[PDB]
């Protein structure tokens, strides 16, 4: 009876840990994507600055 | 990390457009610092020679 319960617990824990790992790291991925858009415009100022110089 | 290193790629992609203006800037700068001053210095000689 203990074994029958232990195996389902471990089986469900695989999915819970998997989904938690995804959710945990989901923030930094978007932070990278957002910075990707930002940096393009940060250095775009250099182009405009040089053009007036 | 694929998305992180992409930040460096877009930076380079823009740096190219910065240096394109740098060539044009350096060109005009050489007209004012080298070509025109040398043309003025050469005229002095043609006058003091007379």
């Amino acid at each position: 009876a203990q074994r029958d319960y232990e195996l389902k617990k471990a089986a469900y824990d695989i999915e819970v840990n998997t989904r938690r790992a995804q959710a945990d790291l989901a923030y930094q991925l978007q932070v990278a994507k957002t910075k990707q858009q930002i940096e393009e415009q940060r250095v775009q100022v250099q182009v405009v600055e040089r053009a007036q110089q | 990390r694929q998305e992180e290193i992409e930040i460096e790629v877009v930076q380079r992609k823009k740096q190219i457009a910065v240096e394109a203006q740098e060539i044009l800037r350096t060109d005009k700068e050489l007209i004012a610092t080298v070509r025109r001053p040398a043309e003025a210095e050469a005229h002095r000689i043609q006058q003091i020679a007379e």
Side-chain angles (χ1 to χ4, degrees), chain A residues 1-2 4-18 21-41 43-49 51-53, chain B residues 2-34 37-43 45 47-50:
Chain A
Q2 178 177 359
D4 200 18
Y5 159 75
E6 293 290 7
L7 308 184
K8 309 304 184 300
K9 174 195 176 184
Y12 306 166
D13 288 347
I14 311 313
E15 175 56 10
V16 173
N17 282 286
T18 296
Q22 183 62 258
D24 175 46
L25 283 169
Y27 190 79
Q28 296 177 2
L29 175 61
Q30 258 294 0
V31 174
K33 285 195 167 190
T34 306
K35 285 182 297 184
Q36 190 277 355
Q37 309 144 6
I38 292 166
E39 292 310 330
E40 182 192 18
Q41 308 311 331
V43 294
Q44 178 59 35
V45 180
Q46 295 293 336
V47 185
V48 182
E49 176 165 311
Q52 310 318 315
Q53 287 178 357
Chain B
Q2 191 282 328
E3 199 74 37
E4 280 196 337
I5 306 305
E6 157 55 21
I7 304 173
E8 301 297 333
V9 175
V10 64
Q11 281 183 41
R12 262 64 170 194
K13 184 61 168 63
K14 280 295 191 186
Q15 283 281 357
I16 289 161
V18 177
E19 295 173 339
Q21 292 288 344
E22 187 130 309
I23 293 163
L24 184 58
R25 180 267 169 110
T26 307
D27 183 72
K28 306 295 178 169
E29 187 77 299
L30 288 167
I31 296 171
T33 60
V34 177
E39 185 172 34
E41 286 167 9
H43 179 277
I45 302 304
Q47 296 302 327
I48 71 182
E50 288 187 4

